Amino acid sequence: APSFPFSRASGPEPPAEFAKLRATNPVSQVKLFDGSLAWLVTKHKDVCFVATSEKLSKVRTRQGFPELSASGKQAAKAKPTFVDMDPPEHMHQRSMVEPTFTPEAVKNLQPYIQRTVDDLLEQMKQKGCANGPVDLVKEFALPVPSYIIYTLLGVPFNDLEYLTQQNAIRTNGSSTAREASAANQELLDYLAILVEQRLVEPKDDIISKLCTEQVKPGNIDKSDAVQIAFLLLVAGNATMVNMIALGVATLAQHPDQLAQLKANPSLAPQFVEELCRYHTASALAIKRTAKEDVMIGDKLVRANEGIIASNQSANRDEEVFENPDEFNMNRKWPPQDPLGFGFGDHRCIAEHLAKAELTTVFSTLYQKFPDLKVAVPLGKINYTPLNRDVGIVDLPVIF
Numbered sequence: 001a002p003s004f005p006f007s008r009a010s011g012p013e014p015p016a017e018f019a020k021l022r023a024t025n026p027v028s029q030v031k032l033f034d035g036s037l038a039w040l041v042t043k044h045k046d047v048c049f050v051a052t053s054e055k056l057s058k059v060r061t062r063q064g065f066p067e068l069s070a071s072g073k074q075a076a077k078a079k080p081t082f083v084d085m086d087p088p089e090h091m092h093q094r095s096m097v098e099p100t101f102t103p104e105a106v107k108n109l110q111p112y113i114q115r116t117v118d119d120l121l122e123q124m125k126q127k128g129c130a131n132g133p134v135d136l137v138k139e140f141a142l143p144v145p146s147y148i149i150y151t152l153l154g155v156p157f158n159d160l161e162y163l164t165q166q167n168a169i170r171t172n173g174s175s176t177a178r179e180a181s182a183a184n185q186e187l188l189d190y191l192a193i194l195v196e197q198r199l200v201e202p203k204d205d206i207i208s209k210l211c212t213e214q215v216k217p218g219n220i221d222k223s224d225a226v227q228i229a230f231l232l233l234v235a236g237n238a239t240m241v242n243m244i245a246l247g248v249a250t251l252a253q254h255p256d257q258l259a260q261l262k263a264n265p266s267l268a269p270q271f272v273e274e275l276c277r278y279h280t281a282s283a284l285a286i287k288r289t290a291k292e293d294v295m296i297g298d299k300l301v302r303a304n305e306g307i308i309a310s311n312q313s314a315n316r317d318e319e320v321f322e323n324p325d326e327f328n329m330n331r332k333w334p335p336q337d338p339l340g341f342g343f344g345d346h347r348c349i350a351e352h353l354a355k356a357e358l359t360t361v362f363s364t365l366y367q368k369f370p371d372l373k374v375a376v377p378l379g380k381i382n383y384t385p386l387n388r389d390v391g392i393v394d395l396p397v398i399f
C-alpha cells in the first residue's frame, strides 16, 4: 500500500496516481503517516456516495478515523464543532451560523465584497512596483478573504490587519513551532474577548448572533461560541487565498482565456466555476470512518475502517467532465456537480461566499490592472509542497 497524501505530479497538477487508479483501481488502500490504512475513493460517483452515505461518520473520536497529520490526531481531542458532527447534532449546530451564508444573504454582501476588493487593489496601485515586483499574495490574495471573514465574524476595521497577519503566521510552513503556537493562541484570545464584548452589547456580526441566540438562551457556552467562530476562520481562509493566487497564475498559463475574460468580466462566474473544478485547493476534507460494513465499487469497507474520497480526482473524472485536464473557462458543463466544495450535508457552508469573493476578484483585478503580469517564469513559481493541498506561497507581479 502506497503512502497518502500522494504527491502532486507537478507544481500545479494533481497526483499522477489518481488517473491511474480511476482506470484500474477506483477504490484502493493507502498508508497514512501513522502506518494506518484508509480506503481511497477516486471516481466522482463513488465520492458523492461517500459524502452522502448515512453509514459513514465524521466523528473523529471514533476509532479508525483517517487523520493525515500529527496535528490532526491532536485536534481530535477537543470538543467537536459541526464540521466533525453527524446528524442530528451536525445541522443542529450548523444552522446557528448558516443564515449568514445563504445565496440571498451573500448577494447583499456583494457591494461590501466589492468595496473590500476595490480598496485593496487601490492600496496596491498606490504602493506601486517601481523598485521591483510585489507579492500578490501578501498584498491581495491574503487580505481579501481574511478581511471579509473577520468582518463577518465581528472584528472592527482597525484590527483586521494585525489579525490577518497572525492567521497567516499560524499556517506558514516556514514558521517555527513556537511562532505558530503563539499566533494560534492570539487568535483564540481575541475571539474570546469579542464574545465577552458581544454578550454585553451585541452588534451586527456572527459572534453576536451566537451570543444572543445560543450562549444566552443556554444552547451553547462561551467556549463553544469561540470555537465555532474559530472554525469559520480557519476552515476556508487558506483555501481562498490559494484559489485567488492560483487563479491569477492560471490566467497567466492561458493568455487566451485571460483575453476572453478581460474582454468580458461577465464571464468571471463561469471562470471561477472552472477554477474551482480545475484547482481543487481542498482535496483532503471528504473523510469518513464506516459505522458498519459498506460496499464501495468492488471493495468491502468493514466497520470502523477509514475512507478518503478525493474530490480533486473526481473533478478530473473523464467520465463526467470532457477533457478533464484542460482548463476551459467556456467549458460546457455536464449535469453532475463539480466537487470543489464537497457534497451532501457537509458541503462547504461558505460556498456562495467563496464564489462571490472569487467572481469579484477576477471581474475586477484585470480591469484595474490590465498590464498586470507575474514577475517570475511560470516554472519558478513558488507552489505549496507537492505532498500538500495545491496552492501558492508567494506570487510576484507587476502592473
Ligand code: HEM
Pocket: 051, 082, 083, 084, 094, 145, 149, 231, 232, 233, 235, 236, 237, 239, 240, 243, 276, 281, 282, 283, 285, 286, 311, 339, 340, 341, 342, 343, 344, 345, 346, 347, 348, 349, 350, 351, 353, 354, 355
Ligand atoms: C474557494 C475556497 C473554499 C473552498 C474551495 C472550500 C472547500 C470546502 C470543502 C472541500 C469542504 C468539505 C465539504 C464536505 O464535507 O464535503 C469545506 C467545508 C467547510 N468550509 Fe469551505 N471552502 C472554501 C471557502 C470557505 C470559506 C470562505 C469558509 C469560511 C466561512 C469555509 C468554511 C467551511 C466550513 C465551516 C466547512 C465545514 C462544513 C460542514 O462540515 O458542515 N469554506 N469547504
Ligand SMILES: [Br-]
Pocket: 142, 146, 163, 164, 165, 166, 167, 168, 237
Ligand atoms: Br489571515
Ligand SMILES: [Br-]
Pocket: 282, 283, 284, 285, 286, 311, 342
Ligand atoms: Br476536500
